[PDB]
């Protein structure tokens, strides 16, 4: 048995969504009714992340829906996507401040630069970007 020691900043805390880039084309892309899209286009609430080592619990307010997932880094956990549905993907740790996973052709990056967190999902030529600050 080998031991691999890694380390990250600390993603714990609630983040207030401030800037959202390209919510429409991307939401519309994944196949979301234009209703929900329009019901959630400029809502900006709070998301929460509770990190304990590599055990992650995170609640997201995506438009008008509160999604809740859990994962462990490098472990194959199943997540619920923005829409009604479910996938299996592995979340990896890049550097000391990146969570990176790909699932369904969607590439998810979550960067933490100090007190602010940028979430970038690029599905093709579409780049959905959300910028929240810890509080």
UniProtKB/Swiss-Prot annotation:
The modification N-acetylmethionine is found at residue 9. One of its GO terms (biological process) is cellular response to hydrogen peroxide. PROSITE patterns: FABP (PS00214). Gene3D superfamilies: 2.40.128.20. Plays a role in lipoprotein-mediated cholesterol uptake in hepatocytes. Binds cholesterol. Binds free fatty acids and their coenzyme A derivatives, bilirubin, and some other small molecules in the cytoplasm. May be involved in intracellular lipid transport. This is Fatty acid-binding protein, liver. SUPFAM superfamilies: Lipocalins. The modification Phosphothreonine is found at residue 59. One of its GO terms (cellular component) is nucleus. GO terms for molecular function: antioxidant activity; chromatin binding; fatty acid binding. Keywords: Acetylation, Cytoplasm, Lipid-binding, Phosphoprotein, Transport. The modification Phosphoserine is found at residues 19, 47, 64, 108. Transmembrane segments: none annotated. Pfam families: Lipocalin_7. InterPro entries: Calycin, Fatty_acid-bd, ILBP. Forms a beta-barrel structure that accommodates hydrophobic ligands in its interior. It is found in: Cytoplasm. The modification N6-succinyllysine is found at residues 39, 44, 54, 65, 86, 98, 129. It comes from the Eukaryota. PANTHER family: FATTY ACID BINDING PROTEIN.
